[PDB]
Amino acid sequence: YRLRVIAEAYATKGLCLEKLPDREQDVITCYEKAGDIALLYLQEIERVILSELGFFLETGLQRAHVLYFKNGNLTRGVGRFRELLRAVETRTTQNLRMTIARQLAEILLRGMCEQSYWNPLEDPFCPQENTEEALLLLLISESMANRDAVLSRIPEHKSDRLISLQSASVVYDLLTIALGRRGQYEMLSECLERAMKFAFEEFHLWYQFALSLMAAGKSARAVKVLKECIRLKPDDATIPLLAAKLCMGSLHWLEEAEKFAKTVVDVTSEFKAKGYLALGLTYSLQATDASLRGMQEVLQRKALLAFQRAHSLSPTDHQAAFYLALQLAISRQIPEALGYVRQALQLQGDDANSLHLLALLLSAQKHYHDALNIIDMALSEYPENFILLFSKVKLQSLCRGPDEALLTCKHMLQIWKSCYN
């Protein structure tokens, strides 16, 4: 009981000395010993209780690091933070270790590089790199934080719920920023899935969970969450764009793609152009999947009309011009298609599909050796392609002779052998 008395005596001594024109480091030292004796008394009383709450002891403990980090004493401040964390937790220090752990995680994440850190025991489970200890801190904090939740009652009071939601949002924000940079998405997705309990009508967690799911490989769950995101806030057009892009991917769902395309089109120019492009691609694929006669031409004319509209709406998109030229070439109209791909290649001349289509058009025009040359520097720029190899083999067999075709076949067999086990 006398220890807290002398601790408050040191606090009052510092409060009086602040009015006298380095004694500040002496006040800091008395603050450190006051904190040490307060922690020792807490340990003794928590041992005794098997066989209260002051006011200024925490001030004396905290103003030391406040001065540390307001005067630039970053090294001593982080060292004292670490030593305070080294104290064994009791039933009265959980919020203090909350706050100090959160601040330490922030300052370590946004304060210095990797080559300016050493182990807690040494002085410049045992962590070896800063993000490891930050991750451990985040796990422990969230693990023994998840039991003070409010679970969205809102009978009459809201403020405590708002504070709890803020704390959850910030802790998961640090978790996301820590784990995203290192390219680990599975554990992040599971973390957000576990966290999903709190939210009831909040856009942020739904958006982040959908993004994490779509960036991890799973698609259908991402599509459903993205649909609910459509339901929540009908202002953004990028979210239906992502849903449509996933729909026509490996999933091979086509009706939903046209639904989302119609939704985004029926809402600036740079977005409705993308919507028209997606609608045209969906129509072209549906045409390719047809089974009777007339509907193929109907969908082809629809697709070329949409592609023309998209091309007109934006003059500096090489993808739109390339796909319009491809659709034109599907319809056997050569000169306009070759002119269009010429314009697209003028827009950008480092592509692969553009050169491949140019070579294909040249071959369809019966100019074999020029297309052969084009394929030659196409392979020169991309020495590890596969489709270009098949096209070159076909062209060589069509023009010169089987010898070079066999040579290329053996070369590509060797390439596959090298690239795989």
Partner 1 sequence: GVVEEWLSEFKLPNYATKSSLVSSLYKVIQEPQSELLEPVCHQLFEFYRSGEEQLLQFTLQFLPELIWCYLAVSASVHSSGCIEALLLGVYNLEIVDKQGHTKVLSFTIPSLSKPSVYHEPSSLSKVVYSGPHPQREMLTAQNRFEVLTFLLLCYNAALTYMPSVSLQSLCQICSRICVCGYPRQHVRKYKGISSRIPVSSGFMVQMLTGIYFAFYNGEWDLAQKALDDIIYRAQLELYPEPLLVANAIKASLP
Binding site for partner 1 (CB under 8 A): 85-86, 89, 110-116, 120-121, 125-129, 131-132, 135-137, 139-140, 143, 169-170, 173-174, 176-177, 180-185, 187, 204, 207-208, 211-212, 214-215, 238, 241-242, 245, 270, 316, 348, 350, 381-384
Cβ 401 to partner 1 shortest distance, Å: 30
**Residue 383: helix, strand or coil by DSSP?**
coil
Q: Which is nearer to partner 1, 251 or 298 (CB)?
A: 251
- CA 52, CA 29: separation in Å to the nearest integer? 25
Cβ 344 to partner 1 shortest distance, Å: 13
Cβ 185 to partner 1 shortest distance, Å: 8
Q: Which is nearer to partner 1, 27 or 378 (CB)?
A: 378
CB atoms within 10 A of CB 218: 13
Q: Which is nearer to partner 1, 29 or 75 (CB)?
A: 75
Q: What angle do CA 389, 391, 396 make, to 5 degrees?
A: 95
Q: Which is nearer to partner 1, 111 or 335 (CB)?
A: 111
CB atoms within 10 A of CB 289: 11
Q: How far is CA 11 from CA 8, 27, 53, in A?
A: 5, 8, 16
Cβ 346 to partner 1 shortest distance, Å: 12
**At residue 18, what are phi and psi to the nearest 5 degrees?**
-65, -15
Q: Which residue reads 């784990």 in tokens? A: 179
Cβ 382 to partner 1 shortest distance, Å: 6
- CA 137, CA 180: separation in Å to the nearest integer? 17
Cβ 120 to partner 1 shortest distance, Å: 6
Cβ 176 to partner 1 shortest distance, Å: 5
**At residue 185, what are phi and psi to the nearest 5 degrees?**
-110, -25
Do the beta carbons of residue 371 and residue 395 sit within 8 Å? Answer: yes
- CA 71, CA 73: separation in Å to the nearest integer? 6
- CA 199, CA 205: separation in Å to the nearest integer? 7
* The amino acid at 394: K
Q: Which is nearer to partner 1, 192 or 299 (CB)?
A: 192
Tokens of 322: 């390339």
Largest CA-CA distance found in the chain, in angstroms, rounded: 102
Which residue pairs, CB below 8 angstroms and at least 24 apart, start in 302-311? 303/327, 304/328, 304/331, 306/276, 306/279, 306/280, 307/276, 307/277, 307/280, 309/276, 310/273, 310/276, 310/277, 310/280
Cβ 134 to partner 1 shortest distance, Å: 10
CA 352 to chain centroid: 28
Q: Which is nearer to partner 1, 153 or 204 (CB)?
A: 204
Q: Which is nearer to partner 1, 115 or 159 (CB)?
A: 115
Cβ 237 to partner 1 shortest distance, Å: 10
- CA 298, CA 409: separation in Å to the nearest integer? 41
Q: Which is nearer to partner 1, 250 or 291 (CB)?
A: 250
Q: Which is nearer to partner 1, 294 or 383 (CB)?
A: 383
